[PDB]
């Protein structure tokens, strides 16, 4: 797919958001808990490999369809 891969830079489980460092060296991408493929998870750990799509974000590039790798 047109899915980018990256690593979770940080994730604040109390606020439900964080950033992803894309593997292409481009700007960090905002991730909202609601963008995560749920299955009774919806949380992310610093350093986790993820796959996502880059989407139209309210303030910058946002991750959509976030999957664990």
Curated annotation (Swiss-Prot):
It is found in: Cytoplasm. InterPro entries: Cold_shock_CspA, Cold_shock_domain, CSD, CSD_CS, CSP_DNA-bd, NA-bd_OB-fold. GO terms for molecular function: DNA binding; nucleic acid binding; RNA binding; single-stranded DNA binding; single-stranded RNA binding; transcription antitermination factor activity, RNA binding. It holds the Pfam family CSD. Residues 6-66 form the CSD domain. One of its GO terms (biological process) is regulation of gene expression. Induction: In response to low temperature (at protein level). Gene3D superfamilies: Nucleic acid-binding proteins (2.40.50.140). Keywords: Activator, Cytoplasm, DNA-binding, Stress response, Transcription, Transcription regulation. Binds to and stimulates the transcription of the CCAAT-containing, cold-shock-inducible promoters of the H-NS and GyrA proteins. Also binds to the inverted repeat 5'-ATTGG-3'. NCBIfam families: PRK10354.1. This is Cold shock protein CspA. It comes from Escherichia coli (strain K12). The gene is cspA.
């Amino acid at each position: 797919s047109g899915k980018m891969t990256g690593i979770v830079k940080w994730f604040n489980a109390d606020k439900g958001f964080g950033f992803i460092t894309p593997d292409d060296g481009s700007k960090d991408v905002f991730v909202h808990f609601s963008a995560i493929q749920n299955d009774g998870y919806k949380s992310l750990d610093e350093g986790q490999k993820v796959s996502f799509t880059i989407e139209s974000g309210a303030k910058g590039p946002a991750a959509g369809n976030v999957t664990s790798l």
